[PDB]
Amino acid sequence: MQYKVVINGHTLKGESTTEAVDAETAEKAFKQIANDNGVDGVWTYDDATKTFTVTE
Secondary structure (H helix, E strand, O other): OEEEEEEEOOOOEEEEEEEOOOHHHHHHHHHHHHHHOOOOOEEEEEOOOOEEEEEO
């Protein structure tokens, strides 16, 4: 399944996508991306669009 993270950061604004078997797998990948970029925000998940949002 095609999952996406929308990054609403103070400095970094954008999106990343990954193919994953489930949302738990995708989530762990997107949290590492946020960690790698120092993005520290609140996480929400929208399963209608398989999209995570992290909002700083």
